[PDB]
Enzyme design. Structure first.
Site, PDB file in Angstrom:
ATOM      1  N   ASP A  28       0.828  -1.394  -0.089  1.00 38.29           N
ATOM      2  CA  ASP A  28      -0.105   0.161   0.080  1.00 38.29           C
ATOM      3  C   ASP A  28       0.707   1.197  -0.099  1.00 38.29           C
ATOM      4  OD1 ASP A  28       0.695  -0.273   2.644  1.00 38.29           O
ATOM      5  OD2 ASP A  28      -1.293  -0.151   3.296  1.00 38.29           O
ATOM      6  N   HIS A  58       0.788   3.782  -2.929  1.00 39.01           N
ATOM      7  CA  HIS A  58       0.470   5.330  -2.422  1.00 39.01           C
ATOM      8  C   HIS A  58       1.650   6.265  -3.073  1.00 39.01           C
ATOM      9  CE1 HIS A  58      -0.507   8.353   0.862  1.00 39.01           C
ATOM     10  NE2 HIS A  58       0.734   8.785   0.382  1.00 39.01           N
ATOM     11  N   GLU A  59       2.794   6.008  -3.303  1.00 36.66           N
ATOM     12  CA  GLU A  59       3.823   6.607  -3.763  1.00 36.66           C
ATOM     13  C   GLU A  59       3.608   6.901  -5.155  1.00 36.66           C
ATOM     14  OE1 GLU A  59       5.092   8.613  -1.664  1.00 36.66           O
ATOM     15  OE2 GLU A  59       4.662   7.097   0.014  1.00 36.66           O
ATOM     16  N   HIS A  61       1.100   9.035  -6.366  1.00 36.61           N
ATOM     17  CA  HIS A  61       1.339  10.590  -6.277  1.00 36.61           C
ATOM     18  C   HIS A  61       1.815  10.963  -7.646  1.00 36.61           C
ATOM     19  CE1 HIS A  61       0.657  11.824  -2.219  1.00 36.61           C
ATOM     20  NE2 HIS A  61       1.123  11.069  -1.614  1.00 36.61           N
ATOM     21  N   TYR A 104      -0.771  20.628  -3.453  1.00 42.09           N
ATOM     22  CA  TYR A 104      -0.430  19.714  -2.159  1.00 42.09           C
ATOM     23  C   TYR A 104      -0.589  20.523  -0.938  1.00 42.09           C
ATOM     24  CZ  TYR A 104       1.533  15.500   0.309  1.00 42.09           C
ATOM     25  OH  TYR A 104       1.837  14.448   1.081  1.00 42.09           O
ATOM     26  N   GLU A 157      -3.899  13.160  -1.101  1.00 37.74           N
ATOM     27  CA  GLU A 157      -3.555  12.208  -0.189  1.00 37.74           C
ATOM     28  C   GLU A 157      -4.412  11.007  -0.210  1.00 37.74           C
ATOM     29  OE1 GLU A 157      -1.133  11.164   2.002  1.00 37.74           O
ATOM     30  OE2 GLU A 157      -0.041  12.420   0.490  1.00 37.74           O
ATOM     31  N   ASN A 176      -3.111 -10.455   2.662  1.00 32.98           N
ATOM     32  CA  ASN A 176      -3.575  -9.711   3.980  1.00 32.98           C
ATOM     33  C   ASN A 176      -4.166  -8.459   3.463  1.00 32.98           C
ATOM     34  OD1 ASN A 176      -2.651 -11.877   5.503  1.00 32.98           O
ATOM     35  ND2 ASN A 176      -0.685 -10.933   5.087  1.00 32.98           N
ATOM     36  N   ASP A 179      -6.535  -4.950   3.580  1.00 33.59           N
ATOM     37  CA  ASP A 179      -7.303  -4.189   4.415  1.00 33.59           C
ATOM     38  C   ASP A 179      -7.589  -2.772   3.914  1.00 33.59           C
ATOM     39  OD1 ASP A 179      -5.074  -2.881   5.204  1.00 33.59           O
ATOM     40  OD2 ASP A 179      -4.511  -4.745   5.917  1.00 33.59           O
ATOM     41  N   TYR A 190       4.687  -0.203   9.851  1.00 31.19           N
ATOM     42  CA  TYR A 190       4.468   0.462  10.991  1.00 31.19           C
ATOM     43  C   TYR A 190       4.523  -0.080  12.309  1.00 31.19           C
ATOM     44  CZ  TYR A 190       2.280   4.724  13.604  1.00 31.19           C
ATOM     45  OH  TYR A 190       2.035   5.444  14.326  1.00 31.19           O
ATOM     46  N   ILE A 230       4.308  -3.268  17.797  1.00 30.51           N
ATOM     47  CA  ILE A 230       2.970  -2.812  18.246  1.00 30.51           C
ATOM     48  C   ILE A 230       2.109  -3.509  17.198  1.00 30.51           C
ATOM     49  CG2 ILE A 230       1.028  -1.287  18.609  1.00 30.51           C
ATOM     50  CD1 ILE A 230       2.998   0.787  19.355  1.00 30.51           C
ATOM     51  N   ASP A 282       1.238  20.413   8.534  1.00 26.22           N
ATOM     52  CA  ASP A 282       1.215  19.085   7.524  1.00 26.22           C
ATOM     53  C   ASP A 282       0.546  19.684   6.161  1.00 26.22           C
ATOM     54  OD1 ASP A 282       0.901  16.589   6.707  1.00 26.22           O
ATOM     55  OD2 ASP A 282      -1.182  16.284   7.397  1.00 26.22           O
ATOM     56  N   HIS A 326      -2.488  15.003   5.355  1.00 26.35           N
ATOM     57  CA  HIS A 326      -2.663  13.534   5.882  1.00 26.35           C
ATOM     58  C   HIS A 326      -3.622  13.270   6.793  1.00 26.35           C
ATOM     59  CE1 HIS A 326       1.579  13.931   4.361  1.00 26.35           C
ATOM     60  NE2 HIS A 326       1.243  12.559   3.527  1.00 26.35           N
TER      61      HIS A 326
HETATM   62  C1  LIG Z   1       4.775   9.733   7.521  1.00 28.61           C
HETATM   63  C2  LIG Z   1       3.527  10.067   7.285  1.00 28.61           C
HETATM   64  C3  LIG Z   1       3.262  10.926   6.159  1.00 28.61           C
HETATM   65  N1  LIG Z   1       3.753  10.321   5.051  1.00 28.61           N
HETATM   66  C4  LIG Z   1       2.749   9.627   4.477  1.00 28.61           C
HETATM   67  O1  LIG Z   1       1.622   9.365   4.559  1.00 28.61           O
HETATM   68  C5  LIG Z   1       3.260   8.720   3.239  1.00 28.61           C
HETATM   69  C6  LIG Z   1       3.950   7.417   3.529  1.00 28.61           C
HETATM   70  C7  LIG Z   1       3.006   6.487   4.102  1.00 28.61           C
HETATM   71  C8  LIG Z   1       2.014   6.081   3.064  1.00 28.61           C
HETATM   72  C9  LIG Z   1       3.906   5.163   4.815  1.00 28.61           C
HETATM   73  N2  LIG Z   1       4.460   9.598   2.509  1.00 28.61           N
HETATM   74  P1  LIG Z   1       3.810  10.939   1.262  1.00 28.61           P
HETATM   75  O2  LIG Z   1       2.524  11.295   1.793  1.00 28.61           O
HETATM   76  O3  LIG Z   1       4.173  10.555  -0.127  1.00 28.61           O
HETATM   77  C10 LIG Z   1       5.079  12.256   1.971  1.00 28.61           C
HETATM   78  N3  LIG Z   1       4.967  13.448   1.367  1.00 28.61           N
HETATM   79  C11 LIG Z   1       5.813  14.134   1.235  1.00 28.61           C
HETATM   80  O4  LIG Z   1       7.230  14.219   1.346  1.00 28.61           O
HETATM   81  O5  LIG Z   1       5.342  15.585   0.723  1.00 28.61           O
HETATM   82  C12 LIG Z   1       6.550  16.566   0.453  1.00 28.61           C
HETATM   83  C13 LIG Z   1       7.203  16.660  -0.847  1.00 28.61           C
HETATM   84  C14 LIG Z   1       6.403  17.408  -2.028  1.00 28.61           C
HETATM   85  C15 LIG Z   1       7.131  17.545  -3.046  1.00 28.61           C
HETATM   86  C16 LIG Z   1       8.359  16.851  -3.492  1.00 28.61           C
HETATM   87  C17 LIG Z   1       8.953  15.924  -2.278  1.00 28.61           C
HETATM   88  C18 LIG Z   1       8.331  15.891  -1.071  1.00 28.61           C
HETATM   89  C19 LIG Z   1       3.548  12.235   6.397  1.00 28.61           C
HETATM   90  O6  LIG Z   1       4.439  12.865   5.500  1.00 28.61           O
HETATM   91  O7  LIG Z   1       3.002  13.021   7.246  1.00 28.61           O
HETATM   92 CA   LIG Z   2       2.605  -2.146  14.127  1.00 29.47          CA
HETATM   93 CA   LIG Z   3      -3.042  -1.804   4.147  1.00 27.81          CA
HETATM   94 CA   LIG Z   4      -2.472  -5.264   4.681  1.00 30.47          CA
HETATM   95 ZN   LIG Z   5       1.204  10.931   0.262  1.00 33.56          ZN
END
Ligand SMILES: CC[C@H](NC(=O)[C@H](CC(C)C)NP(=O)(O)CNC(=O)OCc1ccccc1)C(=O)O
Ligand SMILES: [Ca+2]
Ligand SMILES: [Ca+2]
Ligand SMILES: [Ca+2]
Ligand SMILES: [Zn+2]
Ligand SMILES: [Ca+2]
Length: 316
Positions: A138, A142-143, A146, A157, A166, A183, A185, A193, A197, A226, A231
């Protein structure tokens, strides 16, 4: 690089064995020639210079601990490519088979992953909040999503457009996870993560409030953290998407579920035909209603369910 297509074998972050498409020319490289104009995986070597070095391996076997994040970034990028091609008839993120590039081992203790405008980038995590983030299908999807968004709707953004951006990444991240069918969900990031836990996740689409995120427009965040809560407020849209697919009664509003495939068709069409860089939540509702109308007809259950879901989360 120029070479011949080969098939290596290795172990991912969670210890599972999988085959990977590689390229042989002196070394075996993480270069999959079987998809579009290639999927390429790079070693950032704990530094922040990108992309780093195209991943080279002497024997085509990828069982070292250091190899695991690369195996998964490479393999899951392939699954995500396959989802977009097979399900949506989209060839890579740009629709024209652009090469897909990822770097792993980015920085030290790096608790995130991102699309930098040109490629995917994965930290290893600090071993407490995250293990290497490419271990989550996921997350990888997700990446890459984008990149799809940036080439299509172009949602800015920040604020509501950014929360939609997002949510689109969480929605398709989840749909790719279901496509692979291991698996699956409606949680985000659970496989990588908090290894100490069990049973938690970074976000929940089915119940965003479990991890502190709003599940109704009345609870939206309007501060500046943020990027204006991208997010955080994504929970409102994630909840609507979950309801469209799975149904439920939320703050007394009942939604008839129409299933994941139809959710994906509606949101893919909205993303690619109706959303714009500045779309807000109300405009997303309109785009989703129009998309469902195009696909299923104005009097369809699908249109009715889209309306019910957005009503349930307070978006008119
Ligand atoms: C770590 C939680 C969160 N990150 C996320 O929810 C996910 C990773 C997740 C699916 C494991 N990463 P993401 O949304 O792609 C991070 N976004 C981000 O760095 O945006 C800033 C950016 C903008 C332009 C160019 C580079 C970076 C956050 O950045 O707050
Ligand atoms: Ca965990
Ligand atoms: Ca998942
Ligand atoms: Ca899963
Ligand atoms: Zn993202
Ligand atoms: Ca090796």
């Amino acid at each position: 690089i120029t070479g011949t297509s080969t098939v290596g074998v290795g172990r991912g972050v969670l210890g599972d064995q999988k085959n990977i498409n590689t390229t042989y020319s002196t070394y075996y490289y993480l270069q999959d020639n079987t998809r579009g104009n290639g999927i390429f995986t790079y070693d950032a070597k704990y530094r922040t210079t990108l992309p780093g070095s195209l991943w080279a391996d002497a024997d085509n076997q990828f069982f070292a601990s250091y190899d695991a994040p690369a195996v998964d970034a490479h393999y899951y990028a392939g699954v995500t490519y396959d989802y977009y091609k097979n399900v949506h008839n989209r060839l890579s993120y740009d629709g024209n088979n652009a090469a897909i590039r990822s770097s792993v081992h980015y920085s030290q203790g790096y608790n995130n992953a991102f699309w930098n405008g040109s490629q995917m980038v994965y930290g290893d995590g600090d071993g407490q909040t995250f293990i290497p983030l490419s271990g989550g299908i996921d997350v990888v999807a997700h990446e890459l999503t984008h990149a799809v968004t940036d080439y299509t709707a172009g949602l800015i953004y920040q604020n509501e457009s950014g929360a939609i951006n997002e949510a689109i990444s969480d929605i398709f991240g989840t749909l790719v996870e279901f496509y692979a069918n291991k698996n699956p969900d409606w949680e985000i990031g659970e496989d990588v993560y908090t290894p100490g836990i069990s049973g938690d996740s970074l976000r929940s689409m089915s119940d965003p409030a479990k991890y502190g995120d709003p599940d109704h427009y009345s609870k939206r965040y309007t501060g500046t953290q943020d990027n204006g809560g991208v997010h955080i407020n994504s929970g409102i849209i994630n909840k609507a998407a979950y309801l469209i697919s799975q149904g439920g009664t939320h703050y007394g509003v009942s939604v008839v579920g129409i299933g994941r495939d139809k959710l994906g068709k509606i949101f893919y069409r909205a993303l690619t035909q109706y959303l714009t860089p500045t779309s807000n939540f109300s405009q997303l509702r309109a785009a989703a209603v129009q998309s469902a109308t195009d696909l299923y007809g104005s009097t369809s259950q699908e249109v009715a369910s889209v309306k019910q879901a957005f009503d349930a989360v307070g978006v008119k």
